[PDB]
Amino acid sequence: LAEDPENLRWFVQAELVNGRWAMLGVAGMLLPEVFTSIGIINVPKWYAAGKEEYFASSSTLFVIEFILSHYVEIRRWQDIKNPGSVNQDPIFKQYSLPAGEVGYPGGIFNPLNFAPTLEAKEKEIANGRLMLAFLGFIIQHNVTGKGPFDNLLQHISDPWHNTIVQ
Amino acid sequence: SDPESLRWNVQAELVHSRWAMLGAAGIFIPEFLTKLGILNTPSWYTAGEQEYFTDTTTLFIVELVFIGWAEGRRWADILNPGCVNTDPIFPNNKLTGTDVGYPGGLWFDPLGWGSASPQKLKELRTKEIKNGRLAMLAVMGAWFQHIYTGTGPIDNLFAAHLADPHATIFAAFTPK
Amino acid sequence: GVIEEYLEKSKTNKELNDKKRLATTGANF
Amino acid sequence: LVDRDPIKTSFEQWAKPGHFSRTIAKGPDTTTWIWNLHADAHDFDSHTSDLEEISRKVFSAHFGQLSIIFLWLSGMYFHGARFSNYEAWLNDPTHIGPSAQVVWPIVGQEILNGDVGGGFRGIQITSGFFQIWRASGITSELQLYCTAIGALVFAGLMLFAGWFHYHKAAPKLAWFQDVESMLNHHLAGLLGLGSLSWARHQVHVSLPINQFLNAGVDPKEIPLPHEFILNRDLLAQLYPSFAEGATPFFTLNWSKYADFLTFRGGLDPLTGGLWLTDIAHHHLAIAILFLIAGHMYRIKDILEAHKGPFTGQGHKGLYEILTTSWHAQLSINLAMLGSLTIVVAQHMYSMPPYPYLATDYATQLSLFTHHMWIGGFLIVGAAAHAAIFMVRDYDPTTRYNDLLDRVLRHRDAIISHLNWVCIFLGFHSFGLYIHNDTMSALGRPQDMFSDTAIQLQPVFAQWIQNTHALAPGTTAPGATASTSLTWGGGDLVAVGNKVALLPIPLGTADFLVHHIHAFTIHVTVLILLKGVLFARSSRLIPDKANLGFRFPCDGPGRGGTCQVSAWDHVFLGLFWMYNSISVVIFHFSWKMQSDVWGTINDQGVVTHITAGNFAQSSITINGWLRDFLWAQASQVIQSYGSSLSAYGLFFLGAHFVWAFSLMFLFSGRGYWQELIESIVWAHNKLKVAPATQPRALSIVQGRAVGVTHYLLGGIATTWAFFLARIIAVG
Amino acid sequence: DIAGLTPCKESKQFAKREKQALKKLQASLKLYADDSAPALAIKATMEKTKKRFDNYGKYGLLCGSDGLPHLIVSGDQRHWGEFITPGILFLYIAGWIGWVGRSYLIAIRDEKKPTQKEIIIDVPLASSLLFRGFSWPVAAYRELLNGELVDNNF
Amino acid sequence: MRDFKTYLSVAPVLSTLWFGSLAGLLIEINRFFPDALTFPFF
Amino acid sequence: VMLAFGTPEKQILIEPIFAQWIQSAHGKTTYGFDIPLSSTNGPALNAGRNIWLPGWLNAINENSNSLFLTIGP
Ligand code: CLA
Ligand SMILES: CC(=CC=C/C(C)=C/C=C/C=C(C)/C=C/C=C(C)/C=C/C1=C(C)CCCC1(C)C)/C=C/C1=C(C)CCCC1(C)C
Ligand SMILES: CC(=CC=C/C(C)=C/C=C/C=C(C)\C=C\C=C(C)\C=C\C1=C(C)CCCC1(C)C)/C=C/C1=C(C)CCCC1(C)C
Ligand SMILES: CC1=C(C/C=C(\C)CCC[C@H](C)CCC[C@@H](C)CCCC(C)C)C(=O)c2ccccc2C1=O
């Protein structure tokens, strides 16, 4: 007998998790542009600490890392079904405990709210999308090239290039 | 005895015709206006002189980004808002229909007298030559053939040939 | 295309041409 | 029906569930009615209880055949033109090996397109245009390209005569329900005025334009597009401009001639397609009759006349209702049209009528089996539709006590005989062969049935063949050879590429096939005869005309009570005939190649596609896959990677499609129901089925999808088996 | 690499196939087209199966004996997208055949007499529920198993 | 002339302008890549 | 369709992997091949050897009567 727009919690979240990890995603780039120098795929190995002991390996620099993340990630699941995270800023966003205009079922279109301080994650909405779709762009044009813009000598007009494989 | 044909959206084809041929109005006189030898000769070395070409198929984007914006946002809101779901007011939506657009909304309305009417007088202009464009660019858009086809020597394709007096092209007039 | 002089120096010409005695046909016979 | 009779709308019926009997397609949804609708789409027990229209439809929806045969032929003249090979092949016959069709090299395709003659890639032909086309008192590729649109002309117009009927407010009764003249007209001037007209454009133009082709040239080094008018000056070579005669009669002198005709019989040395110097005379000598003939006559009178004692009192009155039937005057026709097609299939192969046939082997046996399946597929029909009469057509019973009411009177009788006829045959007509196996595999030839063991002795000869090739010495005038070169007496010399026809000998292994045909032709007919006869009433069911001539089967009782009906007698009578024809074919080529087709060289030491292997070895019915099926067919199962390949590559499908028929033929019905629900269940769980109540096949639909498949399977199988053993050696 | 042999980089048996076989194709010393403009074995049909030289791309591709190429696809050494790449593809395409199957269907059974609307078609292909498929991100991978088609409706 | 919440009808076999065509455009991808048996990507 | 059409290539033909597989974990000591933990040695059995699987269940490829026939598409 259930009709239309339901979901409640759901993937309103997903967006604000994608964009905030798309924002902090392009923060991966950023660096190699004003003073260009080091970039592309890099296989970075990140930034690297001191010159004492390491040499290419010293074991997996991430698998040991992500066990920690784990039981600090299922904690949003330790949240999304039954709300709980003192700050309370994604599940519905802040302002304390409001947005129950969608927490107890019955959305339909609901835009929402949040931040005792002035406005909202609202013009921190756009900045969510532009970054989720920017990656789109960012890892779209690798497969062919890796640098952005110069001036009017012989770059910003596109001369001759190789196309896709075939 | 006659076809059950009149589309009901027979109403749409015609304001699709104001598209094709008012648009093709901006073709008949810019083309056949030319300017033969204004003083004489076109010399176009400018935004195409020496910068490795200019357009062609980067022409299409720059052409049809804002023509995409122009044509796109045309029939969508020529008038119709309301736009939802269930039952018919007959064309194949008319979900606006009895509702103009918004009950107590804003300035959805252009002009007075509870309508969109730009008064009753203006049947004079846009009936004749402007829908003449329809019946003009009909055979004068079918001058297309005469103007080029016959492929000025260079090219005969699957040679049947089948006849030979003399050539055919364009410039105006005719032998005889 | 791309032009250098002058769509022509001396314009289009002898390709219809007939002029002094436009003859052939009206004539021949 | 309903919306919105009657006077009050133009406004056409597009939208509102159904039409076709009256608690019709019901509001309530179902699938069966989608095979309904197409099936029985044409029928008449519905549309209206009143003749009238129906003949007003059938004279229209007829029309669109001619128009079609007409859109067809065009794409064949066009095709036999600019997708050329005809120009190329004609200056160069004996040599070429013709094409009209060619692929386009998309995906795998191209293998199918393999050098065919006047220098190009394509797929061959066994459909003897390029040979009617000899005709062209003219030649030229773009020309056929006029004959072609001349085709699309007749069409659009001979297709707007079908607008210019039913849809236009129609004629009525009298118009056909006065029959009085019909054949008067038809046979007189068309039957006549074609054959006639065909005469005029069969010596005028064609004769001369292959009178001096049968030698060399390259066309337009001959036969202009007008040239053949008043100019009766080239008609000078091929007889007089009548010189001093005036409109036949006699006060004529021949000290040395006798107009064109000068009758032939035999076969051109250089183009053995039978002579043309005749072909005018015979068509002329036709038409006359038709010209005189179609001049009866006005109807009863002649049939209202000769009766007797046991004869046919009802002969007299043999149907008012033969102006009031159709289903009757169609079924009669099919027996003739149909039976008058496979009489083609002989006079063709033992008397070619086109230049270059025989030599052309494969381009006239295709023929002799295509024409062969119509002179059969049209005959079982010619029974079906009588069943359709016998059940219903007339209003009441006004027709009475006559030739029929007679035949029926006996009926457990005419079919009582005929039966034993078949088991007499069969035992004399097949186990005959089985002797051989059982006793040649036992092995004692002394006692087989060989063309040599059981008493017959190195001659067949003395019968009637030997008094045919030898008859040009009766009332017979004559003309070197016979009538059909395949007859006993005299002559040999026929053709200079390969061979054509010669005697064709007999005895046994010709004796007994010829008899299996009997028993095969007979038990076919038993089942159609008894089928159409017992159409409406019987002592298994009398309450048995009560629906229609179909109906599945009356019901589990009476013992069986299933097959009965006569849709079904015309369902198991197809089943045979598929054999009737399918084994007659099997006959001709195994002969026509075991002997005849083969080939000359020095001392014309003849070398058949097979040194007569037939001899002692079709008599064994294994020899029929020792010598046939396993012998030839080795060209079908070698055929991969070639040009024809599309045959071997069919021969697996369609040799599959058949072996899919049995599933439709051999199975129940609430079965695929019982199954179709398990399905319908799993369907509902996801929420994906109910709407349009999915249903299994309509008992007799099921039989419809037997049969039809069993044939388009079991048939093209050989259509492949064949074209693959005449293309390439033979 | 695995059971058959190695790819194209070397495959003797495979080579011989290239060569006889096709090229016999040849086979027609001439057969007339000295300059002539139709009979196209000549150009490609060969060269389109042929200029497919010691290159076909390079694809790995295992090639057994007689050197016709076999498909492993076990996701290793090279061969991964001989099933998955064109596998998810088969999945994604279908399922957006029947996601809309369960759509220009679950949109009708209502309003007024809806008893065969389907022998004609309301929006052709559905051309409304159309893209619902590419406009499946996640989709049935959640909303099928939770709600709507919900165990309830199960 | 067609806005929102399903549209106009169509015949019995518009599938014969859907088998023929659409599908038909696909030979049109099976000659652009005149070949398959794995595939490069984009 | 691909043969007949001239193209023996293009032929679709899957090796019977999970088949031969069962047997390179037996005795099908066909033209080597490791397999991660097995290699064709280092680990063999360790827990098994000169008892049990001696000459038997060691027919291998044996083109004549090897027990297991060497499976393909
Ligand atoms: C002069 C002849 C001719 C004419 C005008 C008719 C006319 C008629 N026949 Mg009839 N018939 C004929 C010859 C003719 N028949 C012959 C030779 C036979 C012997 C087979 C029959 C056996 C027959 C039967 C058993 C029935 C009729 C019935 C009918 C009536 C139904 C028509 C219908 O709905 O189409 C029917 C056609 C279809 C529904 C189309 C399906 C065709 C399929 C099977 C395809 C054939 C295979 C082919 C290779 C497929 C195409 C290629 C594919 C692989 C791509 C109609 C009055 C029916 C009736 O009930 O009487 C009122 C009854 O069913 N006929
Ligand atoms: C109009 C006409 C005509 C004609 C003529 C004609 C009218 C002819 C026709 C003919 C016909 C024919 C010749 C037929 C044909 C047929 C066919 C060819 C077919 C075949 C077939 C078969 C065998 C079967 C089926 C299939 C098919 C179809 C293939 C004319 C008229 C007239 C007049 C009045 C005036 C004066 C002159 C005249 C002349 C006197
Ligand atoms: C598997 C198949 C097929 C098969 C097939 C086979 C396996 C077989 C078939 C067959 C068919 C036929 C067969 C038809 C036809 C025809 C014709 C055209 C004929 C003709 C003729 C005539 C004229 C008469 C008689 C003789 C003959 C036959 C010659 C397919 C499958 C599929 C899939 C995967 C999925 C999707 C769909 C498809 C794509 C579809
Ligand atoms: C197998 C078998 C069946 C089962 C056969 C069935 C159900 C065939 C009907 C299948 C239909 C034709 C499938 C139609 C579905 C498609 C047309 C829908 C999608 C449209 C296309 C785009 C695919 C019978 O119903 C039957 C009845 C009586 C005697 C013997 C048998 C018999 O042997």
Short mmCIF file of N, CA, C and O in Angstrom, two decimals, chain B residues 87-151:
data_model
loop_
_atom_site.label_atom_id
_atom_site.label_comp_id
_atom_site.label_asym_id
_atom_site.label_seq_id
_atom_site.Cartn_x
_atom_site.Cartn_y
_atom_site.Cartn_z
N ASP B 87 -4.57 12.23 -15.24
CA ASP B 87 -5.63 12.16 -16.26
C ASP B 87 -5.48 13.12 -17.46
O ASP B 87 -4.67 14.04 -17.42
N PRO B 88 -6.26 12.89 -18.56
CA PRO B 88 -6.03 13.62 -19.82
C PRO B 88 -6.87 14.88 -20.07
O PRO B 88 -8.08 14.89 -19.84
N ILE B 89 -6.20 15.92 -20.56
CA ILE B 89 -6.87 17.08 -21.16
C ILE B 89 -6.55 17.10 -22.67
O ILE B 89 -6.66 18.12 -23.34
N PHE B 90 -6.10 15.93 -23.15
CA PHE B 90 -6.20 15.45 -24.55
C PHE B 90 -5.03 15.50 -25.58
O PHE B 90 -4.96 14.59 -26.42
N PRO B 91 -4.13 16.50 -25.53
CA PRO B 91 -3.13 16.46 -26.61
C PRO B 91 -2.22 15.24 -26.48
O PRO B 91 -2.01 14.51 -27.45
N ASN B 92 -1.72 15.05 -25.26
CA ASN B 92 -0.95 13.89 -24.79
C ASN B 92 -0.26 14.34 -23.49
O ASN B 92 0.83 13.87 -23.14
N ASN B 93 -0.94 15.26 -22.80
CA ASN B 93 -0.58 15.76 -21.48
C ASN B 93 -1.60 16.81 -21.01
O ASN B 93 -2.44 16.52 -20.15
N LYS B 94 -1.53 18.00 -21.61
CA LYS B 94 -2.26 19.21 -21.20
C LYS B 94 -2.48 19.33 -19.68
O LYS B 94 -3.49 19.86 -19.23
N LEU B 95 -1.50 18.85 -18.91
CA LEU B 95 -1.58 18.87 -17.46
C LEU B 95 -1.60 20.29 -16.90
O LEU B 95 -1.93 20.51 -15.73
N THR B 96 -1.25 21.25 -17.76
CA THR B 96 -1.49 22.66 -17.47
C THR B 96 -3.00 22.91 -17.61
O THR B 96 -3.69 23.12 -16.61
N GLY B 97 -3.51 22.85 -18.85
CA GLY B 97 -4.94 22.89 -19.13
C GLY B 97 -5.72 23.98 -18.43
O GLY B 97 -5.43 25.17 -18.58
N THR B 98 -6.72 23.56 -17.65
CA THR B 98 -7.60 24.47 -16.92
C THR B 98 -6.82 25.43 -16.01
O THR B 98 -7.15 26.61 -15.93
N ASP B 99 -5.77 24.91 -15.36
CA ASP B 99 -4.80 25.75 -14.66
C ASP B 99 -3.92 26.48 -15.68
O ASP B 99 -3.39 25.87 -16.60
N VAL B 100 -3.79 27.79 -15.50
CA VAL B 100 -2.90 28.58 -16.35
C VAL B 100 -1.45 28.18 -16.09
O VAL B 100 -0.70 27.89 -17.02
N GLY B 101 -1.09 28.14 -14.80
CA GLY B 101 0.25 27.75 -14.37
C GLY B 101 0.35 27.63 -12.87
O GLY B 101 0.66 26.55 -12.35
N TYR B 102 0.06 28.73 -12.18
CA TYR B 102 0.11 28.78 -10.72
C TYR B 102 -1.16 29.45 -10.17
O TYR B 102 -1.51 30.55 -10.61
N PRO B 103 -1.85 28.78 -9.23
CA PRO B 103 -2.93 29.45 -8.50
C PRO B 103 -2.37 30.43 -7.46
O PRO B 103 -1.84 30.00 -6.43
N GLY B 104 -2.50 31.72 -7.74
CA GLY B 104 -2.03 32.79 -6.84
C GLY B 104 -0.51 32.91 -6.75
O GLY B 104 0.01 33.40 -5.75
N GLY B 105 0.17 32.48 -7.81
CA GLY B 105 1.63 32.39 -7.83
C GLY B 105 2.40 33.70 -7.83
O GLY B 105 2.79 34.19 -6.77
N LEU B 106 2.62 34.27 -9.02
CA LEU B 106 3.44 35.47 -9.18
C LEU B 106 3.02 36.25 -10.44
O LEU B 106 1.85 36.64 -10.59
N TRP B 107 3.97 36.50 -11.34
CA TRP B 107 3.68 37.08 -12.64
C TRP B 107 3.96 36.06 -13.75
O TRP B 107 4.78 36.29 -14.65
N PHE B 108 3.27 34.93 -13.67
CA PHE B 108 3.23 33.93 -14.74
C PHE B 108 2.67 34.56 -16.01
O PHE B 108 2.98 34.13 -17.12
N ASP B 109 1.83 35.58 -15.82
CA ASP B 109 1.06 36.21 -16.88
C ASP B 109 1.87 37.24 -17.66
O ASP B 109 2.50 38.11 -17.07
N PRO B 110 1.87 37.11 -18.99
CA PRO B 110 2.19 38.28 -19.81
C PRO B 110 0.89 39.00 -20.19
O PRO B 110 0.04 38.42 -20.88
N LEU B 111 0.75 40.24 -19.73
CA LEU B 111 -0.33 41.15 -20.14
C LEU B 111 -1.67 40.94 -19.43
O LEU B 111 -1.87 39.94 -18.74
N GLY B 112 -2.57 41.91 -19.60
CA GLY B 112 -3.89 41.90 -18.99
C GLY B 112 -4.89 41.04 -19.73
O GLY B 112 -4.55 40.40 -20.73
N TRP B 113 -6.14 41.04 -19.25
CA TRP B 113 -7.19 40.10 -19.67
C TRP B 113 -6.77 38.64 -19.46
O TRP B 113 -6.09 38.06 -20.30
N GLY B 114 -7.19 38.09 -18.32
CA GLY B 114 -6.78 36.76 -17.83
C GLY B 114 -6.39 35.71 -18.85
O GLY B 114 -7.05 34.68 -18.97
N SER B 115 -5.30 35.98 -19.57
CA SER B 115 -4.78 35.09 -20.61
C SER B 115 -3.29 35.36 -20.87
O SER B 115 -2.61 36.00 -20.07
N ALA B 116 -2.80 34.84 -22.00
CA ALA B 116 -1.45 35.14 -22.48
C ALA B 116 -1.54 36.04 -23.71
O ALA B 116 -0.52 36.46 -24.27
N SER B 117 -2.78 36.34 -24.10
CA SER B 117 -3.11 37.11 -25.31
C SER B 117 -2.31 38.40 -25.50
O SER B 117 -2.32 39.27 -24.63
N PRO B 118 -1.59 38.51 -26.63
CA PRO B 118 -1.05 39.78 -27.09
C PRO B 118 -2.01 40.42 -28.10
O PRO B 118 -1.63 40.69 -29.24
N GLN B 119 -3.25 40.62 -27.65
CA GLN B 119 -4.36 41.17 -28.45
C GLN B 119 -4.71 40.46 -29.77
O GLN B 119 -4.04 39.51 -30.19
N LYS B 120 -5.77 40.95 -30.42
CA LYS B 120 -6.47 40.22 -31.47
C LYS B 120 -6.12 40.68 -32.89
O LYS B 120 -6.40 39.98 -33.87
N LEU B 121 -5.50 41.86 -32.99
CA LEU B 121 -5.29 42.54 -34.27
C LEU B 121 -4.24 41.88 -35.17
O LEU B 121 -4.39 41.87 -36.39
N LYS B 122 -3.20 41.31 -34.55
CA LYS B 122 -1.99 40.87 -35.28
C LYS B 122 -2.09 39.54 -36.05
O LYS B 122 -1.24 38.66 -35.91
N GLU B 123 -3.14 39.43 -36.86
CA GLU B 123 -3.26 38.34 -37.83
C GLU B 123 -2.69 38.78 -39.17
O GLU B 123 -2.48 37.95 -40.06
N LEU B 124 -2.43 40.08 -39.31
CA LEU B 124 -2.05 40.69 -40.59
C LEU B 124 -0.70 40.23 -41.12
O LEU B 124 -0.61 39.69 -42.23
N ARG B 125 0.35 40.45 -40.33
CA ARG B 125 1.70 40.13 -40.75
C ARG B 125 1.87 38.62 -40.88
O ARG B 125 1.90 38.09 -42.00
N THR B 126 1.95 37.94 -39.74
CA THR B 126 2.49 36.58 -39.64
C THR B 126 1.63 35.45 -40.24
O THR B 126 1.95 34.27 -40.07
N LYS B 127 0.56 35.82 -40.93
CA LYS B 127 -0.27 34.83 -41.62
C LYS B 127 0.24 34.57 -43.04
O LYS B 127 0.40 33.42 -43.44
N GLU B 128 0.51 35.64 -43.78
CA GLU B 128 0.86 35.51 -45.20
C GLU B 128 2.31 35.11 -45.46
O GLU B 128 2.60 33.92 -45.56
N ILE B 129 3.22 36.08 -45.58
CA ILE B 129 4.60 35.78 -45.98
C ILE B 129 5.34 34.94 -44.94
O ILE B 129 6.20 34.13 -45.29
N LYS B 130 5.00 35.13 -43.66
CA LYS B 130 5.67 34.39 -42.58
C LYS B 130 5.34 32.90 -42.53
O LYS B 130 6.20 32.09 -42.16
N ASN B 131 4.11 32.53 -42.87
CA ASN B 131 3.80 31.12 -43.16
C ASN B 131 3.88 30.86 -44.66
O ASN B 131 3.72 29.72 -45.12
N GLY B 132 4.14 31.92 -45.42
CA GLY B 132 4.54 31.80 -46.81
C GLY B 132 5.88 31.10 -46.84
O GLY B 132 6.12 30.24 -47.68
N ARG B 133 6.73 31.45 -45.87
CA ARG B 133 8.02 30.79 -45.67
C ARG B 133 7.87 29.28 -45.77
O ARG B 133 8.74 28.60 -46.32
N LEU B 134 6.75 28.77 -45.26
CA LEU B 134 6.40 27.36 -45.35
C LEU B 134 6.27 26.94 -46.82
O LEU B 134 6.93 25.99 -47.26
N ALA B 135 5.45 27.67 -47.56
CA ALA B 135 5.15 27.35 -48.96
C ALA B 135 6.13 28.00 -49.95
O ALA B 135 5.97 27.86 -51.17
N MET B 136 7.13 28.70 -49.42
CA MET B 136 8.15 29.35 -50.25
C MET B 136 9.41 28.50 -50.25
O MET B 136 9.87 28.05 -51.30
N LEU B 137 9.95 28.28 -49.06
CA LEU B 137 11.09 27.40 -48.87
C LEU B 137 10.68 25.95 -49.14
O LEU B 137 11.46 25.01 -48.93
N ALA B 138 9.45 25.79 -49.61
CA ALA B 138 8.95 24.51 -50.10
C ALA B 138 9.59 24.20 -51.45
O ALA B 138 10.32 23.21 -51.57
N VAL B 139 9.33 25.04 -52.46
CA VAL B 139 9.93 24.84 -53.78
C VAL B 139 11.21 25.66 -53.96
O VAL B 139 12.03 25.33 -54.81
N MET B 140 11.37 26.72 -53.16
CA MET B 140 12.60 27.52 -53.15
C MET B 140 13.61 27.01 -52.11
O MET B 140 14.74 27.52 -52.00
N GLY B 141 13.18 26.03 -51.32
CA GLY B 141 14.09 25.19 -50.55
C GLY B 141 14.33 23.90 -51.32
O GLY B 141 15.22 23.12 -50.97
N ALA B 142 13.52 23.69 -52.35
CA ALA B 142 13.69 22.58 -53.29
C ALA B 142 14.37 23.05 -54.57
O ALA B 142 14.44 22.32 -55.56
N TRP B 143 14.86 24.29 -54.55
CA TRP B 143 15.80 24.77 -55.56
C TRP B 143 17.19 24.23 -55.21
O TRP B 143 18.11 24.29 -56.03
N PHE B 144 17.30 23.71 -53.99
CA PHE B 144 18.45 22.94 -53.50
C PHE B 144 19.00 22.07 -54.62
O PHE B 144 20.14 22.26 -55.04
N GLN B 145 18.18 21.15 -55.11
CA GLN B 145 18.52 20.27 -56.24
C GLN B 145 19.20 21.00 -57.40
O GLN B 145 20.36 20.73 -57.73
N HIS B 146 18.46 21.92 -58.01
CA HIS B 146 18.91 22.68 -59.18
C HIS B 146 20.26 23.37 -58.95
O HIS B 146 21.12 23.35 -59.83
N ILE B 147 20.44 23.93 -57.76
CA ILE B 147 21.61 24.75 -57.41
C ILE B 147 22.96 24.01 -57.46
O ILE B 147 23.98 24.59 -57.85
N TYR B 148 22.98 22.73 -57.08
CA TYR B 148 24.25 21.98 -57.03
C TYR B 148 24.24 20.62 -57.73
O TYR B 148 25.17 20.32 -58.50
N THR B 149 23.21 19.82 -57.48
CA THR B 149 23.17 18.43 -57.94
C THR B 149 23.40 18.33 -59.45
O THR B 149 23.02 19.23 -60.21
N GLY B 150 24.02 17.23 -59.87
CA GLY B 150 24.61 17.11 -61.19
C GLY B 150 26.11 17.12 -61.02
O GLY B 150 26.86 16.94 -61.98
N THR B 151 26.52 17.35 -59.77
CA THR B 151 27.91 17.34 -59.32
C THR B 151 28.92 17.89 -60.34
O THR B 151 29.57 17.11 -61.06
#
